[PDB]
């Protein structure tokens, strides 16, 4: 399908729902990937945004093709001299080691 959709497996069939956008004006991306303690750093940076015009803060994990996931279950062990590349629409983010921005 040309438009993005959400799908899952229900029994032997595939159930597909619709999709709803969020407030694009209020979007924040953390520039630090270091979490609490050690060796439990987040695999992907967190994104804070809101839904439509409702005044409320929502924090989730950025996915692929400009997708927001509310389940922050993506964790990985800290690795020295790491490097990360992310693509958001027509922009790229380069994360040296586990911090900074480019």
């Amino acid at each position, epitope marked *: 399908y040309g438009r993005p959709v959400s799908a899952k497996f229900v029994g032997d069939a595939i159930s597909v729902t619709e999709c709803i956008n969020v407030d694009q004006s209020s979007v924040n991306i953390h520039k630090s990937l270091r979490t609490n303690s050690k060796d439990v750093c987040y695999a992907r940076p967190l994104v804070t945004f809101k*839904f*439509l*015009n*409702s*005044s*409320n*803060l929502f*924090t989730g994990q950025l996915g692929a093709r400009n997708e927001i996931i*509310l389940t922050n279950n993506q964790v990985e062990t800290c690795k020295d001299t790491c490097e990360h590349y992310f693509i958001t629409r027509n922009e790229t983010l380069v994360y040296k080691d586990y911090a900074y921005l480019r």
Partner: antibody
Amino acid sequence: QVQLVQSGAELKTPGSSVKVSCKASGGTFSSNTVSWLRQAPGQGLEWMGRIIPIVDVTNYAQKFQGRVKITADKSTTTAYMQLSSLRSEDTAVYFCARDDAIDPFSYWGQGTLVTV
Amino acid sequence: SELSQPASVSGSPGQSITISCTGTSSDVGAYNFVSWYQQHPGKAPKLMIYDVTKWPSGVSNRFSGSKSGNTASLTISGLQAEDEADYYCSSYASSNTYVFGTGTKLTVL
């Protein structure tokens, strides 16, 4: 001018299950988030939990995980909060606030008094 | 990690009263969504200060707020009237969790 309606006070034995229903006026729930806040007599305020029906996502406090169940209905625009194993100090008033484009909780209900 | 607020603050007519609100840097020191709510005895809470210092619509401008470091201060200049509603300080925290202050009671002569 969205109005909130809360159920009347109910008496339940300690350790039982208490269900509170909050009705929201207006057209529909839309993107608004419905939050529940309890206030003890003479005490402060704390955040219990919230529900967003657009994604049907419930956010709970770290001290109330697994004890409070929050559900919403897209047809009757009614939110149900269930808290079983009610303890004595649990007795308090309950408000079902609503998020607004100006700021969240911009609205407050009548309140439900729960006595243990 | 509930926010800490003064138990009570004195006051007098024709005077300005400042109420402080401090907490962990993870909630108030990382975001700028602090708010102050006034609650009358036996009445629903009312919001008068939101965001950082922007006033809402259809409210008195005698109240102001300013957040410095990890501490926010709400200053009121309009004395007289009632000025008896309890003030509570709230802020946004991580993990999609909200917090509220203990509460501040204002007394006037």
